[PDB]
Subunit: 119 residues, 4 copies
Amino acid sequence: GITGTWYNQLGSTFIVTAGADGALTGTYESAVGNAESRYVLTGRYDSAPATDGSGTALGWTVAWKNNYRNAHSATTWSGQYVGGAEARINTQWLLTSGTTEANAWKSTLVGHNTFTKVK
Amino acid sequence: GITGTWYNQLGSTFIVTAGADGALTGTYESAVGNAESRYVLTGRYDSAPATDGSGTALGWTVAWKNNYRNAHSATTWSGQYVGGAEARINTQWLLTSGTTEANAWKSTLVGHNTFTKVKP
Amino acid sequence: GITGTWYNQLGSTFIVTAGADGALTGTYESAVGNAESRYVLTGRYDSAPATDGSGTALGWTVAWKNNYRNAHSATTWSGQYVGGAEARINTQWLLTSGTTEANAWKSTLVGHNTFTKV
Amino acid sequence: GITGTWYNQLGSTFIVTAGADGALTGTYESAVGNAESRYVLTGRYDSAPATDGSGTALGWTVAWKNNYRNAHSATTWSGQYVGGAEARINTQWLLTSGTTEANAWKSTLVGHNTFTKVKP
Ligand SMILES: O=C(O)CCCC[C@@H]1SC[C@@H]2NC(=O)N[C@@H]21
Ligand SMILES: O=C(O)CCCC[C@@H]1SC[C@@H]2NC(=O)N[C@@H]21
Ligand SMILES: O=C(O)CCCC[C@@H]1SC[C@@H]2NC(=O)N[C@@H]21
Ligand SMILES: O=C(O)CCCC[C@@H]1SC[C@@H]2NC(=O)N[C@@H]21
């Protein structure tokens, strides 16, 4: 159920393939921030989740460097996939920018993104 | 650089290879939690960082399933590599467990881990 | 404004008074977790926000001890009040439980709550 | 144990009084950021912590407005006090700035601060 195209509330698009062994691979296009076009993502998911209706744990990373630009930053999303009629990937994220040691205290933004199969 | 064997303040072991086009691959062994032995990790790093003294942004994920056990959880680490005499990787992390909808509010732990190449 | 009775997506009830000195005071009742009835809260907000359409920054704390129960934990909410026609308070929160030193790595939960007066 | 002056790794100073009723009141001076001089803080703590000597849960808020400046922002710290010879308050924090709705996704910084009774 994870493989495919997902949309979040910001207008971003997350295109992922879930491998049999726990691999996530794909591309991410952000509607906001210091970003243009698609970026490589990689991550992992629980490939033998519980079957009690609980979600499937997963996470992925994007480093915000592609052929077009480099924001000198990286985001990780941690969350879970919930299937069914209203399928969702519910996440929290951490965006770290490369900083000097003196500015390290303000290096990391936190937020939440909910991904759905329709936008 | 980033490639090597790293240890955090909990005694966990992070073995990573940084590929030329931005890939991180390796293994993670946690000294704590519902975990034993090594788990696969993948991630990304900025393969052309700024040259002004800024760190190198990176992140990686571990899903806590291996041949021995499955915690039905995953952790991401977001942070930066800081080079120099004593290299460091400074991170914050999010650990999400699979939950029911009613328990989703308590799905995710947050913390910080600093990694160095110094064995416990 | 901020003063009033607010509810989040979990069904918790946040009753707050915003003082002109930047103080928040009131009570919190959680619909979830190791909690019953009302808990005291205190916090702060920006009492002279920007006039350019930006939200009003705020935060508050609840320690989960009252006359009935003690969870040995505390939550902080950090966020902003958005005054539109349908006012909201959008937050992220940290819940720290008291732990031993060896379990401190797993002391703190993170999440998000959005509050409305509906 | 909590009442007094505390220092973090950034060089900031936290002066707090812990009331019998669970109240934290005091002032905070940040060494970094859009801040000068002292700011009011208020918070809460567990006035009856566990008998097994676990830490004492607590939190507090600073809105970054005083008589000298207004950053249009607020920080909350959530953590625990640990007593004894090397007493500490170990925290994670969230700093939210007032933003437009369009910029709300980048409103909130996260970090960690460890407070000690002696300045590092
Ligand atoms: O500005 C940057 O440094 C790079 C772009 C970051 C976009 C962030 S990642 C978290 C959030 N979710 C999104 O879809 N976009 C923003
Ligand atoms: O308990 C689990 O669900 C799996 C093991 C989690 C271990 C965590 S990941 C964040 C922190 N840093 C570590 O090295 N170990 C813990
Ligand atoms: O379980 C505990 O330790 C005490 C109750 C915590 C309830 C949490 S606070 C964050 C979230 N928002 C709510 O309204 N309730 C939960
Ligand atoms: O820049 C601002 O908006 C106001 C000052 C924020 C300073 C932050 S609060 C978290 C961290 N810990 C500190 O002692 N200082 C920084």
